[PDB]
Symmetry: C3
Subunit: 130 residues, 3 copies
């Protein structure tokens, strides 16, 4: 039996009051990831670049656990500019099907006032593996 | 056995990286719905009208699956004006009990900066059926 | 068998379209709590004081049910000032381990535009008890 707690060597890492992710068993969940630039360690200005890195981090954790984005049941993403979603949404959906994730997980994205680390976007989705 | 994926002919419909809703089986979940005006296809200015339509869409999906709002375990709603919640909250609670939903599902509403489609409100709640 | 619904005599109490909390059984969930000052009934200006009270309310409900913060699988908290998180995060993590909550539940905090009751912060986390 297992419950939450998900270690990995790709995500932003956990060193505070939270872990990289949580594996409840059969139903996984990813914390509010962020485009922690691999060279700046924060959030690339390139809404597309930062948007792509954030997706890799969220998947890296779920992948290190033994799953895939395709399994993602639901997904949530906070944006600092709903006008930029045009590029993120176009690439967000184009990658899922390009990764074999046509299931299309639930969505819950909204324009928040701000985000941790001044990040221009956050990612938090759920995944299953029945 | 089932997992996520919920089709319907009432909700805003899914044509991107997400589905109308997701049925994990026994525990359903609705995506961030929106008052997609049946005549404008976006969000009626009438905070009350748009607030009512949004509730119907969220219920239409759960209803098309085989459940009811009364079963809703938790609920989340983003507002663009916490001052308007006075009318939404008054009608939100008056409809639940009027629909046989006295259980009172969890709440998680907050004043967000913006919302998809420039909608003045979003709805995302969970439902059970043990 | 049980499903949602969690009564208590410590939390902000439920008198509208939502209950104090919801106990799905084995997997609990707390609604968007708030620092409802015990003397003002709203939200203390002391970001630290209000931040501490909010934590007690969220735990009071889960405690009245038969669990602890340590069991918390995931956690979400809306802030009105990401600059204040420096004090909340420092005390948030210092209390978990001080309460025996080193598990570190998932995180999902963001700077929202506003919050119910003009509260300067909201709390909503999940808990397990397998």
């Amino acid at each position: 039996m297992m419950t939450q707690i998900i270690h990995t060597e790709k995500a932003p890492a956990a060193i505070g009051p939270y872990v990289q992710a949580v594996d409840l068993g059969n139903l996984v969940l990813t914390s509010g990831q962020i485009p922690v630039n691999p060279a700046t360690g924060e959030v690339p200005a390139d809404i597309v670049a930062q948007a792509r890195q954030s997706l890799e981090n969220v998947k890296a954790i779920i992948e290190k656990a033994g799953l895939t984005a395709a399994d993602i049941v639901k997904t949530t993403v906070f944006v600092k500019d709903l006008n930029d979603f045009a590029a993120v949404n176009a690439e967000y959906e184009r990658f899922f099907k390009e990764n074999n994730h046509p299931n299309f997980p639930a969505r819950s994205c909204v324009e928040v006032a701000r985000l941790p680390k001044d990040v221009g976007l956050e990612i938090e989705a759920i995944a299953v593996r029945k």
